[PDB]
Amino acid sequence: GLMQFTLPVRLCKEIELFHFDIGPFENMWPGIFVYMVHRSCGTSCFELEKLCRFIMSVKKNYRRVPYHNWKHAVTVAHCMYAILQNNHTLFTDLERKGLLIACLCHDLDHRGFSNSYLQKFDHPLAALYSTSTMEQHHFSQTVSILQLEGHNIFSTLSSSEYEQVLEIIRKAIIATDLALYFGNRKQLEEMYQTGSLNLNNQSHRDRVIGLMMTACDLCSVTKLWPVTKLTANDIYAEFWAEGDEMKKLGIQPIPMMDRDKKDEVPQGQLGFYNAVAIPCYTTLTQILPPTEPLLKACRDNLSQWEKVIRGEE
Numbered sequence: 001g002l003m004q005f006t007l008p009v010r011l012c013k014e015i016e017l018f019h020f021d022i023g024p025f026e027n028m029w030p031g032i033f034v035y036m037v038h039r040s041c042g043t044s045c046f047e048l049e050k051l052c053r054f055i056m057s058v059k060k061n062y063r064r065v066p067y068h069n070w071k072h073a074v075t076v077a078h079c080m081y082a083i084l085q086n087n088h089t090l091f092t093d094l095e096r097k098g099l100l101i102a103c104l105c106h107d108l109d110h111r112g113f114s115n116s117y118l119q120k121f122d123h124p125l126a127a128l129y130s131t132s133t134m135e136q137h138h139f140s141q142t143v144s145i146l147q148l149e150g151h152n153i154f155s156t157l158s159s160s161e162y163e164q165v166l167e168i169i170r171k172a173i174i175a176t177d178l179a180l181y182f183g184n185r186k187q188l189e190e191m192y193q194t195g196s197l198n199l200n201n202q203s204h205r206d207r208v209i210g211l212m213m214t215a216c217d218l219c220s221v222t223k224l225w226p227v228t229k230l231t232a233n234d235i236y237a238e239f240w241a242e243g244d245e246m247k248k249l250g251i252q253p254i255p256m257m258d259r260d261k262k263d264e265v266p267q268g269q270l271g272f273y274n275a276v277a278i279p280c281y282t283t284l285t286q287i288l289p290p291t292e293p294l295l296k297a298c299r300d301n302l303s304q305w306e307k308v309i310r311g312e313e
């Protein structure tokens, strides 16, 4: 009850920054996450014993794939923590509780393949969920783990608060389907520009939380250049494995996933930063001004990919 998690001084200071890297020591990631829940939400949000037991069941249900792993889960939750801390008063007690949990859970039991590969392989999950296949699976795995004995971290919530937080988590996780991001940002762009955007409109909040989820999920592009560059290697290791599997089904993969087009990675990153990342962090900065450091970091990393193409590294 009187038990504060603290971190060594360098982590205690740097964890507050958007560009924080959670480091290579796997055994400190749970402590880091708990530290963030305590400062974001309070020491009273969750029964510590249940939270720790929930964190370790979430960890056990992420796989040893190169990118969509437990490190990704905690990284995406840290980005959300920074957004929530820099926008203290804009979010409800339930949203603060629900979103950190949503981020930790958003890629639960990922196998390192896109919704497309599941559909072209005819994986059973593609018959159970026709769109946002993995993302409906991820939410499903979240509910399963919440229903394990000693794991219901929301037990102190009311019947209606409980349903509200599970619905925040569902929409948050669904929104990490990048196919849904483009439309969601286009609507937010217009609503902000015409001045119709209203954070008392629940459907407006939904869209804004959805954009925060895309921002957090993509935050590898907002890190110091060496973190950004080395995460890109992990991202392509999954994509190229998927490309190999596409070829095994007798299908030319998209260039993104073809390890034979390694040479084109720098140009593919430019496309990605211009089509996806920059517009994402731009719109987010408009709606939530204190998130500007994510936009600024993203533009710096774009400029580093430009330098790679020009042979200056």
Ligand SMILES: Cc1ncc(C)n2nc(CCc3nc(N(C)C4CC4)nn3C)nc12
Pocket: 218, 220, 221, 232, 235, 255, 256, 257, 261, 262, 264, 265, 266, 267, 268, 269, 271, 272
């Ligand atoms: C950094 C990051 N974070 C999240 C995600 C989902 N991605 N996806 C990419 C791939 C981007 C991309 N690469 C290509 N290549 C290499 C084609 C051969 C030319 N095309 N495109 C669009 N990078 C990210």
Ligand SMILES: [Mg+2]
Pocket: 106, 107, 134, 176
């Ligand atoms: Mg995902």
Ligand SMILES: [Zn+2]
Pocket: 072, 076, 106, 107, 176, 217
């Ligand atoms: Zn993710």
